[PDB]
Amino acid sequence: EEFRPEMLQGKKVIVTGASKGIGREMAYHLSKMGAHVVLTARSEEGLQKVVSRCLELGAASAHYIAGTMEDMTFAEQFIVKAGKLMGGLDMLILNHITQTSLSLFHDDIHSVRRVMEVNFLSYVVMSTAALPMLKQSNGSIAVISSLAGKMTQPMIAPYSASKFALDGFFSTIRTELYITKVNVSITLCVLGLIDTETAMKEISGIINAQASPKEECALEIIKGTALRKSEVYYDKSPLTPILLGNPGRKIMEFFSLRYYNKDMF
Amino acid sequence: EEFRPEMLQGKKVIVTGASKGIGREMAYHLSKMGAHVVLTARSEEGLQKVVSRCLELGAASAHYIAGTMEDMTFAEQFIVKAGKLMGGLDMLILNHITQTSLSLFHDDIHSVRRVMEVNFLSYVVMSTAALPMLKQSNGSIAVISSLAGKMTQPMIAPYSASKFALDGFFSTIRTELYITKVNVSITLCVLGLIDTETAMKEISGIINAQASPKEECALEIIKGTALRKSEVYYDKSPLTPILLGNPGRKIMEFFSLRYYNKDMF
Ligand SMILES: NC(=O)C1=CN([C@@H]2O[C@H](COP(=O)(O)OP(=O)(O)OC[C@H]3O[C@@H](n4cnc5c(N)ncnc54)[C@H](OP(=O)(O)O)[C@@H]3O)[C@@H](O)[C@H]2O)C=CC1
Ligand SMILES: NC(=O)C1=CN([C@@H]2O[C@H](COP(=O)(O)OP(=O)(O)OC[C@H]3O[C@@H](n4cnc5c(N)ncnc54)[C@H](OP(=O)(O)O)[C@@H]3O)[C@@H](O)[C@H]2O)C=CC1
Ligand SMILES: O=S1(=O)N=C(NC2CCCCC2)O[C@H]2CCCC[C@H]21
Ligand SMILES: O=S1(=O)N=C(NC2CCCCC2)O[C@H]2CCCC[C@H]21
Asked: For ligand 3, is residue A149 a contact (CB within 6 Å)?
């Protein structure tokens, strides 16, 4: 019940949004653990540098495939190719997001649509394409989310919408896999403010809050996903998982199954 | 304050998904109250029947515009036309959903995108198009959701993702409207199982649960929206709003505003 880095030695892992931030940090940890990694982002040069560092850090293998997660064809084909490169898949880390800026929502449809497409729809595309490989290996999916995917805050209406959608979709999948006795685990990672350049830049002169270090955040995601935890909370305050954990919802979800015809599962 | 039907006499109301189920019942209740209504759904014939009955029931005026909410152009233009018809807008009822059957997740991306566009994107398009008129009248928006938009249960992963996304988006809009002193209210109506023809048919052989009556459901939505409540819970069990209400998220959302720069609003 306690994490050991050997749990990832020789494992076949995908990390999306791996050129910088938490994604790049996750690729490094996995590499030090001796895992096989396939990395993605739009930046070829950014991916080349991470792959090269991963190989130095002890990765069993490291490859990159560049493209945009706004294209559902690329998202799906990326899974198929990553799977063929490693000869299977043990863990899928859905980490990427499209660019978001803090602003009161005002006449901004186009941004809600592109945000929903990248932040949510490509996550559905990739988890669907990856599932047969994860079923064979009794794999895991880490779904990266935020406090804004469990509560609301001003200035992030499109982003919050997409992260709430991930919770609604992925918690239904987790339960469906559990009740059908499919040994594939789903870890929703609820992250507080992290000290990546993107998050720090985006809140500059808008929000004044303490950030958590990106390195430790990355390790916690990997550990919680390896341990098959339903949810991982990572924030400075110890109150965050207590206040966002929603025990009422958990009680309702437990009793919910009693109403279904057992034959469906 | 208590709701009095006299509050809605002469008011200008839009109802979507008004050809059947709770939408139809809401059109009837508003008609009885003496409101002006503009109804929409795909069925021209279905809407013609509801409109005639609305007129017989005492509506100040009753009109319909048929079309599909998969088309964002129709969603927006409908709001503009409805506005022209009544000479303004006081209340916007966002009630439509796509056809939803219960199955363990197995849809392709085209099917999930369609659910996200109809159940979610069209609500964002319409609430955005209606905002100048609602700002002029100090109007209201009712966003129809379900228990599956506050917790998860098997066999409705896309539907649940779409309803969670509505909580995420609209709760952010509500807080933004509040902090900028805009007197436009937003009511998220979290509904339990309702005895509609569609819901009863879809659960046949799958779920055995107590349904609540459609005409009381309809009235409860109207009452809570007119009263400008942030959320309305409508279900047989009194444990439902207690267990789904999430006091912890409310505590966090309250404390969250203190991190922000006042000058941004
Ligand atoms: N940082 C924080 O404070 C917090 C972060 N999170 C979550 O952590 C995750 C990662 O966060 P973070 O590291 O800060 O963000 P970063 O901006 O640091 O990195 C995001 C990654 O996504 C990639 N990316 C951007 N646009 C696209 C696109 N269209 N297609 C494909 N890849 C894309 C970027 O690479 P490239 O530009 O080359 O494509 C980059 O590698 C997200 O899911 C976020 O919601 C949650 C809470 C707080
Ligand atoms: N009934 C229940 O148990 C529950 C219902 N709810 C919520 O209540 C609302 C309505 O419920 P209910 O009355 O049972 O459902 P119904 O199927 O009874 O009616 C839904 C309405 O949506 C219309 N519609 C369907 N597809 C489209 C489309 N593509 N574009 C435009 N309109 C469309 C339908 O008419 P047409 O075919 O003519 O277009 C119809 O008028 C939904 O938002 C649902 O989530 C929440 C919890 C439980
Ligand atoms: O911890 S969060 O809920 N998620 C995030 N997510 C970021 C949003 C901007 C781009 C990087 C990710 O940031 C925090 C600060 C802005 C408001 C929400 C909080
Ligand atoms: O009350 S709900 O959470 N929402 C709904 N929404 C309906 C889903 C089927 C078509 C009409 C709306 O139905 C209930 C029964 C099936 C599972 C979910 C619950």
From this structure: no
CB A245 within 8 A of CB B248: yes
Q: Cβ of B116 and A116 within 8 Å?
A: yes
Q: Tell me if A199 CB under 6 Å of ligand 3.
A: yes
Across the interface, of B112, B206, B251, the residue whose CB is closest to A264 is B206
Which of A93, A99, A132, A64 has the alpha carbon at shortest distance from A226? A93
Residue B129 CB contacts under 8 Å (≥ 6 apart), including other chains? B75, B76, B79, B80
Among residues B97, B107, B228, the alpha carbon closest in space to that of B165 is found at B97
Cβ within 8 Å, pair A161-B154: no
Amino acid occupying residue B58: G
Partners of B191 in the β-ladder: B146, B234
The answer to whether A161 and A170 are in contact (CB under 8 A) is no
Taking the C-alpha atoms of residue A51 and residue A62, their distance in angstroms, rounded to an integer, is: 6
Question: Do A103 and A59 contact (CB within 8 A), yes or no?
Answer: no
Nearest CA to ligand 4 atom 14: B193
- CA separation for the pair A125, A59 (Å, rounded): 27
Three-class DSSP category at B115: helix
Indicate if the alpha-carbon torsion angle A97, A253, B223, B12 is positive or negative.
positive
Distance A202 CA to ligand 3 centre (A): 8
Distance between CA B176 and CA B179 in Å, rounded? 5
Pull the structure tokens for residue B77. 């233009």
Which position has the token pair 């339960």? A175
Nearest to B248 among A158, A243, A256 (CB): A243
Domain count, chain A: 1
In chain A, residues preceding a discontinuity (C to N beyond 2.5 A) are none
Experimental approach was: X-ray
Q: What is the CATH number of the domain that holds A239?
A: 3.40.50.720
Q: How many CB atoms lie within 10 A of CB A58?
A: 13
Instruction: Find the distance separating the first CA and the last CA of chain B, reported in whole Å.
Output: 30
Structural domain span for residue A213: 1-265
Resolution of this model in Å is: 2.2
Q: How far apart are CA B43 and CA B68, in angstroms?
A: 9
Q: Is B118 helix (H, G, I), strand (E, B) or coil?
A: helix
Please give, one letter per residue, the 3-state secondary structure of A74-135: HHHHHHHHHHHHHCCCCEEEECCCCCCCCCCCCCCHHHHHHHHHHHHHHHHHHHHHHHHHHH
DSSP assigned state of A144: E
Best residue for ligand 4 mutational test, from B22, B103, B147, B206 (most atoms within 8 Å of Cβ): B147
